[PDB]
Amino acid sequence: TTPDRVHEVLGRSMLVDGLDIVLDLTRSGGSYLVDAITGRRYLDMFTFVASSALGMNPPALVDDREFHAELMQAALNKPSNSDVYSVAMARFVETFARVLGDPALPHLFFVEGGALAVENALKAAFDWKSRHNQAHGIDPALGTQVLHLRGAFHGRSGYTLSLTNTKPTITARFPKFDWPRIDAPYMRPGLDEPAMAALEAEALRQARAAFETRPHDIACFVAEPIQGEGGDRHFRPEFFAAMRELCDEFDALLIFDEVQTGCGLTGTAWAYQQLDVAPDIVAFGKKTQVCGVMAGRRVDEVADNVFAVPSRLNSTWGGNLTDMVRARRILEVIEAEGLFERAVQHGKYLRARLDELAADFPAVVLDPRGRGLMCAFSLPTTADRDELIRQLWQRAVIVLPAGADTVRFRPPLTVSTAEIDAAIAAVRSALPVVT
Amino acid sequence: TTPDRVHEVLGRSMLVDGLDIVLDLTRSGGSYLVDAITGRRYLDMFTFVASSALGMNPPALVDDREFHAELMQAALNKPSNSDVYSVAMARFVETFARVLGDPALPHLFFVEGGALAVENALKAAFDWKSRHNQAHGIDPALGTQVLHLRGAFHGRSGYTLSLTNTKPTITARFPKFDWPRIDAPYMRPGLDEPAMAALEAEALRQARAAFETRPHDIACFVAEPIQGEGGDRHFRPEFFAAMRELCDEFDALLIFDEVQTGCGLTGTAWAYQQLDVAPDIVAFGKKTQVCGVMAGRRVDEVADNVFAVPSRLNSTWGGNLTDMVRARRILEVIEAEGLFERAVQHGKYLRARLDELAADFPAVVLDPRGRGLMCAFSLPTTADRDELIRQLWQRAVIVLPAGADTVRFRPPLTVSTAEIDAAIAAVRSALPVVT
Numbered sequence: 001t002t003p004d005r006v007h008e009v010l011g012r013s014m015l016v017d018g019l020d021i022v023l024d025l026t027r028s029g030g031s032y033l034v035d036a037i038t039g040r041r042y043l044d045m046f047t048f049v050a051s052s053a054l055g056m057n058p059p060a061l062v063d064d065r066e067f068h069a070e071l072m073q074a075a076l077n078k079p080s081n082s083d084v085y086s087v088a089m090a091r092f093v094e095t096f097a098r099v100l101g102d103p104a105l106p107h108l109f110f111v112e113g114g115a116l117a118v119e120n121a122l123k124a125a126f127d128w129k130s131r132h133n134q135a136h137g138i139d140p141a142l143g144t145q146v147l148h149l150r151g152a153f154h155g156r157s158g159y160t161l162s163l164t165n166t167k168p169t170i171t172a173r174f175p176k177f178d179w180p181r182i183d184a185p186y187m188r189p190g191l192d193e194p195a196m197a198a199l200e201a202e203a204l205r206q207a208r209a210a211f212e213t214r215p216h217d218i219a220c221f222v223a224e225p226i227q228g229e230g231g232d233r234h235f236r237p238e239f240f241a242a243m244r245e246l247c248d249e250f251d252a253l254l255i256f257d258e259v260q261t262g263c264g265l266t267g268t269a270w271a272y273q274q275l276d277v278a279p280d281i282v283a284f285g286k287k288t289q290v291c292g293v294m295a296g297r298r299v300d301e302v303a304d305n306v307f308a309v310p311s312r313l314n315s316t317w318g319g320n321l322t323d324m325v326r327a328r329r330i331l332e333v334i335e336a337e338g339l340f341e342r343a344v345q346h347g348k349y350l351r352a353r354l355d356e357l358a359a360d361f362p363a364v365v366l367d368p369r370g371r372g373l374m375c376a377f378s379l380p381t382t383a384d385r386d387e388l389i390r391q392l393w394q395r396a397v398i399v400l401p402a403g404a405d406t407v408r409f410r411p412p413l414t415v416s417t418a419e420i421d422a423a424i425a426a427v428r429s430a431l432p433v434v435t
Numbered sequence: 436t437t438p439d440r441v442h443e444v445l446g447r448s449m450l451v452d453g454l455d456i457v458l459d460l461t462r463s464g465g466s467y468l469v470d471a472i473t474g475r476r477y478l479d480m481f482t483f484v485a486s487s488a489l490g491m492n493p494p495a496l497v498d499d500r501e502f503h504a505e506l507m508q509a510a511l512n513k514p515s516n517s518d519v520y521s522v523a524m525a526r527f528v529e530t531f532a533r534v535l536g537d538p539a540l541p542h543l544f545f546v547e548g549g550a551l552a553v554e555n556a557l558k559a560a561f562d563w564k565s566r567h568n569q570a571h572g573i574d575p576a577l578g579t580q581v582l583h584l585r586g587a588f589h590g591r592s593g594y595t596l597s598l599t600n601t602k603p604t605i606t607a608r609f610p611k612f613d614w615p616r617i618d619a620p621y622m623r624p625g626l627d628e629p630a631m632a633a634l635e636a637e638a639l640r641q642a643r644a645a646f647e648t649r650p651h652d653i654a655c656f657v658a659e660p661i662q663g664e665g666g667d668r669h670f671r672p673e674f675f676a677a678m679r680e681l682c683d684e685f686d687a688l689l690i691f692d693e694v695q696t697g698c699g700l701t702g703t704a705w706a707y708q709q710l711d712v713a714p715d716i717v718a719f720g721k722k723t724q725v726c727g728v729m730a731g732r733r734v735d736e737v738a739d740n741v742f743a744v745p746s747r748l749n750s751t752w753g754g755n756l757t758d759m760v761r762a763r764r765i766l767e768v769i770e771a772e773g774l775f776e777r778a779v780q781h782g783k784y785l786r787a788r789l790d791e792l793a794a795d796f797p798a799v800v801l802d803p804r805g806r807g808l809m810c811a812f813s814l815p816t817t818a819d820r821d822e823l824i825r826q827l828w829q830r831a832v833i834v835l836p837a838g839a840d841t842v843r844f845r846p847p848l849t850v851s852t853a854e855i856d857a858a859i860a861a862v863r864s865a866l867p868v869v870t
C-alpha cells in the first residue's frame with residue numbers, strides 16, 4: 001500500500017476528514033512536515049494539535065544510538081506498568097519529577113489520553129470531598145459536582161462531556177450531569193482594569209452563588225489557565241487568585257487542566273506558574289506523550305485519598321511505556337537546551353510580529369494575543385477565518401482554527417525566528433486575498 | 436537508577452502496589468518474565484492482564500530487521516492519526532480488517548484505552564437512538580440509558596463507572612447515572628438445561644421490564660460475552676440470542692465488550708463468533724494494543740450516525756501509531772501461524788488438565804471452566820483463593836485473581852503444552868499446602 005493509496009484504503013473503514021497529505025515519517029524534521037505524495041514541505045505551526053514539543057525527528061533523539069536501543073526495548077512490548085515496574089519507567093518518573101515537578105504536588109499518576117487525565121483529577125476530587133464531608137459530620141453522598149467555565153474544553157469522555165462546551169457537535173445527544181457552569185471573564189480588546197474587574201466580579205458572584213445553593217456538593221473547580229479549543233482566551237491572574245480563595249472558603253479543590261498549556265509552551269513548565277496561583281491538582285497530556293495528574297496541596301489533608309489507597313484509580317496499562325521512554329528523552333533535551341527560556345524569547349518575537357500585523361491590517365487582524373509560544377489572533381467573521389486557513393494551506397503553512405473566529409499558532413519549542421518570519425510572510429500574502 | 440532502586444524511586448511519587456519483581460525488557464521471552472533483580476524466570480499466565488497475544492519479545496518481531504525499521508520510524512514521534520494519515524497507519528487498518536474484520540461491521544474507530552473504546556460504542560448508541568427516535572416522531576431527548584449486567588466490568592471512566600459493578604472499591608464515591616442493571620444468568624455447576632433456562636427467563640423478564648418502564652430511552656444493551664474481572668462467568672448462547680431479539684424488538688443496539696475476550700483468546704477472532712449472535716457494535720482493546728470499536732448492522736439505518744458525520748467522535752491522537760505498527764505485525768503472525776486454531780487445541784488441553792485437578796481435589800478445585808485459552812477455576816473461600824495465588828508466586832507462576840474466589844489463566848496464544856503442564860504441576864504442589 002503506497003502513499004497515493006492511503007486515503008482510499010482508510011476510506012473503506014473510516015471517515016477520512018483529515019489533511020490531504022500523507023505524512024513522510026522519515027523525511028519530516030523540525031518545523032517541517034513532508035508530504036510523501038509530492039515531497040512538498042509544510043511549515044508546521046500545528047504540531048499534532050500542540051502535542052509535539054520538539055517537532056518531527058529531533059536530532060537529539062534521532063542521532064542518539066543509546067536512546068535508540070532503549071526506545072526499541074520499550075517499543076517491542078507493551079507492559080502493564082500498573083502491575084509491573086521497570087528501569088525504563090523509573091527513569092521516566094524521576095526525570096518527570098525533576099524537570100516538571102512541583103514540590104507541593106508530589107503524587108504522580110499516569111494514564112493514556114488527555115480526557116482520562118482530567119477524569120482522574122475529577123475522581124480524586126470527588127473522593128476527597130466525600131471523605132472530607134464524612135470527617136466533618138456531613139453526608140458522604142455529597143460532593144459530586146464540578147464547577148467549570150463557559151467555553152471550556154476538557155475532553156470527550158463520560159465526565160468531560162459534562163464540562164466541555166465549545167461546539168454543539170461535540171456534546172449533542174450525549175447524556176450529561178447537570179453541573180454548575182459560570183461565565184468566563186477572559187480578556188478582550190478595549191476593556192481596561194476597572195472594566196475587567198467588573199467582568200471578573202460577575203463571574204465570581206456566579207461562582208459564589210453556585211457554592212451557596214449546592215452546599216457541600218461541589219468537589220472542585222476546574223479550568224484551563226488559557227482556554228485553547230474555545231479560542232485562546234486568556235484570564236488575568238486576579239481572576240484565578242480570587243477563585244483560589246473561594247475554593248478554600250468552601251472546601252473545594254482547584255484543578256488546572258494543563259493538557260494544552262503545559263510542558264513549556266507558555267515559557268514555564270506550567271502556565272499556572274506564571275499566574276501565581278497554587279492548584280491542588282494538575283492534569284497534563286499532549287506534549288508529555290504520557291498523560292496523567294500531579295496532586296498535593298489540600299489533597300493530603302484526607303489521609304485515605306485516592307493516591308494513598310490501592311485500586312481507587314487504575315487502568316490496564318498505566319500509560320504507554322514507549323511514550324514514557326520518548327518523553328524522558330524529550331524532557332532531558334528541554335532541560336539541557338534551556339527550551340523554556342527559548343519559548344519565552346521566541347514567544348515575545350512572534351507576539352511582536354502579530355502586533356505589527358494588527359497595525360498594518362487594523363480592521364482585519366483583531367486581538368493579537370499570547371503567552372510564550374501560545375499565540376493567536378482573530379478575524380471579523382468565521383468565513384474570513386476559514387478562508388485565511390485555506391489560503392495558508394495553499395501556501396504550505398499549517399495552522400489551526402479555534403472558536404468561531406480565531407487562528408492559533410502552536411509552533412514547536414525549537415522554532416527559529418526565520419520560521420516565524422516565514423509564517424508571518426504567508427499571513428501577509430494571504431490577507432489581501434481574504435479581504 | 437538500577438533494578439534494585441526501581442521501587443524506591445517510584446515510591447517517592449506513587450503508590451507502589453504491583454509485583455515484587457523488576458521486569459527485564461531484554462531477557463524476558465515467550466511465556467517467561469525475567470526478574471532483573473535476581474534473574475529468576477516466572478511462568479507467565481497473566482500476560483499483562485491478558486493484553487499480550489504472543490508473550491514477551493516474540494522471535495517473529497525481534498528477528499525481523501525490516502519490521503525494526505518500521506517500528507522505530509513510528510516510535511520516534513507520535514502523530515495525531517485523527518488528522519494526519521500515514522502508510523504505517525493504512526497498513527495497520529487493512530490488516531486489522533483482513534484478520535479481525537466482520538463484513539457486517541465495516542466502520543472502524545481507534546482510540547487509546549479500553550474504557551474509552553467502550554465509551555465510544557456507547558456514544559454511537561446514544562446518538563443512533565436519539566436520531567432513530569427523532570425520525571419516527573419520538574422526542575430526541577430520549578435514548579440516554581444503558582441496559583447492562585450485574586458483575587460487569589467495562590472500565591473506570593465517566594460512563595463506564597455507571598456500568599462496572601464488581602468490587603465497591605472501584606466505584607465508591609464517584610457520581611453515576613441511574614441506568615438499568617439486570618441479573619447475570621451465568622452457568623454454574625449442578626444446574627441442568629431446565630434450571631439454566633429458568634435462570635435466563637428471569638434475567639430476560641427483568642430486561643423486558645426495563646424496556647417497558649423506560650420507553651424509547653434505552654439506547655443499548657452492553658455485555659461481556661464472558662465476564663472477566665467479575666469472575667470468568669460464562670453464558671449460554673441461548674441467553675444472548677434472546678437478548679438479541681429483545682434489543683431488536685425495542686430498537687436498541689447490542690454491544691459486546693470484547694476488550695478482554697477478543698483477538699483469539701477464546702479460539703476465534705472474537706468470542707461472539709462462537710455464540711452465533713450478531714452484535715451492532717464491538718469494543719476491543721488489550722491484545723489489539725490500539726483500542727477501538729467496529730460498528731455496522733443496524734448502525735447504518737441512521738444515515739447521519741457518528742461514523743458518517745465528522746467530529747462526533749474524536750481524540751487528539753486517534754490511537755498510538757507505535758501500537759498500530761506493533762499490532763499490525765502481531766496480526767500477521769497470528770494469521771501466518773494459525774494461532775486461533777492453536778488456541779482451540781491448547782485450550783482443550785488446559786481445560787482437560789483442570790478437569791483432572793477437580794477430580795483429584797473435589798472439595799477444593801471447584802467449577803473448572805473455559806473457552807479456548809480463557810480458563811479458570813474457583814476455590815471454597817476467598818482466603819483459600821488468595822493463599823493459592825501466594826503459593827504460586829512462591830513457585831514462580833503468575834496467575835490473576837478474579838471475583839471473590841476465582842483463579843484465572845491468561846496464557847499467551849503461543850503457550851506450549853509443557854508450559855501448561857508446569858503451571859498445573861505448581862497448582863498440584865500448592866493445593867495440599869492451602870488445604
Ligand SMILES: Cc1ncc(COP(=O)(O)O)c(CN)c1O
Binds near residue numbers: 155258259260261
Ligand atoms: C485543555 C484540554 N483538555 C483535555 C483535552 C483532551 O485531550 P485528548 O484528546 O488526548 O483526550 C484537550 C484536547 N484538545 C484539551 O485541549
Ligand SMILES: Cc1ncc(COP(=O)(O)O)c(CN)c1O
Binds near residue numbers: 314551
Ligand atoms: C471487559 C473489559 N472492558 C474494558 C476494560 C477497561 O480497559 P482499560 O483498563 O484499558 O481501560 C477492561 C479492563 N480489564 C475489561 O476487562
